[PDB]
Amino acid sequence: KQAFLILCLLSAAFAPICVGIVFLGFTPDHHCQSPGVAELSQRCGWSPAEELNYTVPGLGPAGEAFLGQCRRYEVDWNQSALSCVDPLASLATNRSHLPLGPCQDGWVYDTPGSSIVTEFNLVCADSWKLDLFQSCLNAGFLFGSLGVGYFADRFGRKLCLLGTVLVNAVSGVLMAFSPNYMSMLLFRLLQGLVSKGNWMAGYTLITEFVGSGSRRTVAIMYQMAFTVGLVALTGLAYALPHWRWLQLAVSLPTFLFLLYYWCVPESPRWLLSPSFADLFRTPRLRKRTFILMYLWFTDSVLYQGLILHMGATSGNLYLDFLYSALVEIPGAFIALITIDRVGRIYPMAMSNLLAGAACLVMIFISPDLHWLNIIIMCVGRMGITIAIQMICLVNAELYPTFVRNLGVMVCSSLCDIGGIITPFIVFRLREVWQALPLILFAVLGLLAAGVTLLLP
Ligand SMILES: CN(C)C(=N)NC(=N)N
């Protein structure tokens, strides 16, 4: 189906943009680059795993990995007077007493490729800027979910969608060529503006075309196109290690889509009072609005939360991610079936409870049981996927046609606000205690579970 394919491609191409940070911006293990260590290593013959025993701050209670990652012994490594057995025994009565400094001269990264982290040195004190990368995108989303309606009111639909697709394709391509963090964040923001606009527009068009009976099914099929997008993201990120190659390979298809769309007649897609206060005027409607806002926020937070957490902590990222993407499909069938069989409130509650429990269990798990961790992670991802499917319908059902679209605009803006807050909770906060983010996700999931039961 051409008329179906041309929109599902525009859904599948959105997933590499939203989640791509997990592959464009991994943080590999690193230590302070150390001038003269290469010379002393050449003299003494230290192998890669051996040099880190003698040339980096040692681990201890409470890890001390921060010292290894962000400090270095200020030793005169050029000295041939140093012992090749262990130079630090020649220099101090105890290693603890050596002079220590910051990595003034550079960084060494254990990867054959590169990521934005490795390429702009977003390590140690700079590491917040990495969360600033995903935050700028979700800020683009927030400005999109509100400004796109006004724009499309003031600018013609065909012109609007042509513009936003061209700008998405270009800005995504140009991001690969950004030479500095400022320009990269600006392209990330422009793409944040236009990507959600395109995604919502394509969704609207596909649901406007398909008959009202099949429309509901086609919505879930359009979601599953996102999962196929995640699978493609994994494949490309495995074939193309350097983040620029990946960014081009991700962006190009949306460019070629315009070279296709212009070459053949596709005009029907574009050719074919509400007030914010009225969403709150009455206490029951107001309460339901608050609940839907909360649940959209919670599921956004948990979805990006689990994906970024996995990106930050998984030991076999590519298969830990592949086996997680391919779980949304069974999740989609479980959703569609259960929606038809017994409704939507009980599934949305149970699936949020399942997500909360899965997050909580990941606190207690012994992490060497990688096979258990990946299973619980999959159970969580399935849960939050089913909940997102359910709430996409429930947010239509609980608002009347007089305000339904404004309710969607609100809820989506709440999702984008959660997308803005989630990164700093996942990374910039995780350095306090690795349980913390999972405690938050557990609490959020359990509350979303309990709160859900109040909806009619
Ligand atoms: C993570 N976000 C906000 C998405 N674009 N995807 C989704 N289906 N919610």
**CATH (domain of 432):** 1.20.1250.20
Query: Do the domain assignments include residue 190?
Result: no
Cα→Cα distances 157→10, 161, 406, Å: 17, 6, 18
Technique behind the model: cryo-EM
Task: Indicate the SS3 state at residue 102.
Answer: strand
State the distance from the centre of ligand 1 to the C-alpha of 300, rounded, in angstroms: 7
Bridge partners of residue 30, in order along the sequence:
109
Instruction: Show which of 93, 109, 125 is a domain's final residue.
Output: 109
Cα→Cα distances 362→314, 319, 327, 427, 436, Å: 12, 18, 18, 17, 11
State the distance from the centre of ligand 1 to the C-alpha of 403, rounded, in angstroms: 22
Task: Indicate the SS3 state at residue 104.
Answer: coil
* Cα–Cα dist 350/345, whole Å: 9
Phi/psi-derived region of residue 102, left when phi > 0, alpha when psi is between -120 and 50, beta in every other case: beta
Instruction: Show which of 109, 127, 149 is a domain's final residue.
Output: 109
> Which residue type sits at 388?
I
Residue 261's CB is within 10 A of a number of other CB atoms, namely: 15
Residue that is written with structure tokens 């599948």 in the block: 12
| CA-wise closest residue to 403 among 320, 286, 298, 241 | 286
| CA-wise closest residue to 418 among 18, 199, 135 | 135
Residues 6+ apart with CB under 8 A from 368: none
* Cα–Cα dist 339/296, whole Å: 18
Residue 431's CB is within 10 A of a number of other CB atoms, namely: 10
Query: Do the domain assignments include residue 241?
Result: no
Please give the number of the atom of ligand 1 that sits closest to the Cα of 415: 3
Residues 6+ apart with CB under 8 A from 277: none
For a ligand 1 pocket test, name from 300, 324, 413, 420 the mutation site with the most ligand atoms within 8 angstroms of its C-beta.
300
- Protein residues whose CB sits closer than 6 Å to any atom of ligand 1: 18, 226, 300, 303-304, 388, 415, 419
Contact yes or no for 14/230 (Cβ under 8 A): no
Residues 6+ apart with CB under 8 A from 223: 11, 328, 332, 388, 389, 392
* Cα–Cα dist 230/19, whole Å: 8
Sign of CA dihedral 103, 104, 108, 109: positive
Q: Write down how long the chain is.
A: 456
Instruction: Show which of 70, 92, 109 is a domain's final residue.
Output: 109
Shortest-distance Cα residue to atom 5 of ligand 1:
18
Query: Do the domain assignments include residue 308?
Result: yes
State the distance from the centre of ligand 1 to the C-alpha of 415, rounded, in angstroms: 8
Query: Do the domain assignments include residue 263?
Result: no
CA within 13 Å, CB half, 431? 14
Bridge partners of residue 100, in order along the sequence:
73
75's tokens? 């030793």
| CA-wise closest residue to 143 among 201, 205, 204, 195 | 195
Preceding residues of all breaks in the chain (C to N beyond 2.5 angstroms)? 272
State the distance from the centre of ligand 1 to the C-alpha of 198, rounded, in angstroms: 13
Cα→Cα distances 186→16, 139, 175, 193, Å: 18, 11, 9, 11
Contact yes or no for 136/260 (Cβ under 8 A): no
> Which residue type sits at 224?
M
State the distance from the centre of ligand 1 to the C-alpha of 10, rounded, in angstroms: 14
Please give the number of the atom of ligand 1 that sits closest to the Cα of 14: 5
Query: Do the domain assignments include residue 393?
Result: yes
Residues 6+ apart with CB under 8 A from 72: 31, 32, 34, 56, 57, 100, 101, 102, 103
| CA-wise closest residue to 418 among 11, 129, 134, 204 | 134
* Cα–Cα dist 2/209, whole Å: 13
Shortest-distance Cα residue to atom 3 of ligand 1:
300
* Cα–Cα dist 116/122, whole Å: 7
Residue that is written with structure tokens 């609005």 in the block: 289
Sign of CA dihedral 386, 387, 388, 389: positive
Contacts by 426-432 with C-beta closer than 8 Å and gap 24+?
Answer: 426/131, 426/304, 426/305, 426/308, 426/309, 426/312, 427/127, 427/130, 427/131, 427/308, 427/312, 428/127, 428/128, 428/131, 430/309, 430/312, 431/127
Contact yes or no for 33/103 (Cβ under 8 A): yes
Name the phi and psi angles at 72, rounded to 5: -155, 145
Query: Do the domain assignments include residue 119?
Result: no
Domain range holding 415?
Answer: 273-456
Contact yes or no for 72/78 (Cβ under 8 A): no
Determine the angle formed by the axes of helices 2-12 and 243-261, rounding to 10 degrees: 150
Q: What is the domain count for the chain?
A: 2
Bridge partners of residue 63, in order along the sequence:
60
Residue that is written with structure tokens 């957490």 in the block: 309
Residue that is written with structure tokens 């500095």 in the block: 180
DSSP letter at 293 equals: H
Q: How far is CA 353 from the centre of its chain?
A: 22
Coarse DSSP helix, strand, coil percentages of the chain, rounded to the nearest 5 percent: 70, 5, 25
Please give the number of the atom of ligand 1 that sits closest to the Cα of 138: 3
Please give the number of the atom of ligand 1 that sits closest to the Cα of 141: 3
| CA-wise closest residue to 392 among 331, 443, 442 | 331
Please give the number of the atom of ligand 1 that sits closest to the Cα of 304: 1
Residue 260's CB is within 10 A of a number of other CB atoms, namely: 11
The angstrom resolution of this structure is 3.5
Query: Do the domain assignments include residue 284?
Result: yes
Please give the number of the atom of ligand 1 that sits closest to the Cα of 226: 8
Query: According to DSSP H, which parts of 262-282 are helical?
Result: 268-271
Task: Indicate the SS3 state at residue 25.
Answer: coil
Helix (H) or strand (E) holding 126, with range, is none
Contact yes or no for 175/191 (Cβ under 8 A): yes
Number of H helices, E strands in the chain: 20, 4
Query: Do the domain assignments include residue 399?
Result: yes
| CA-wise closest residue to 219 among 338, 347, 393 | 393
* Cα–Cα dist 276/362, whole Å: 40
State the distance from the centre of ligand 1 to the C-alpha of 279, rounded, in angstroms: 23
* Cα–Cα dist 373/306, whole Å: 12
Task: Give the alpha-carbon dihedral of 419, 424, 430, 436, to 10 degrees.
Answer: -60
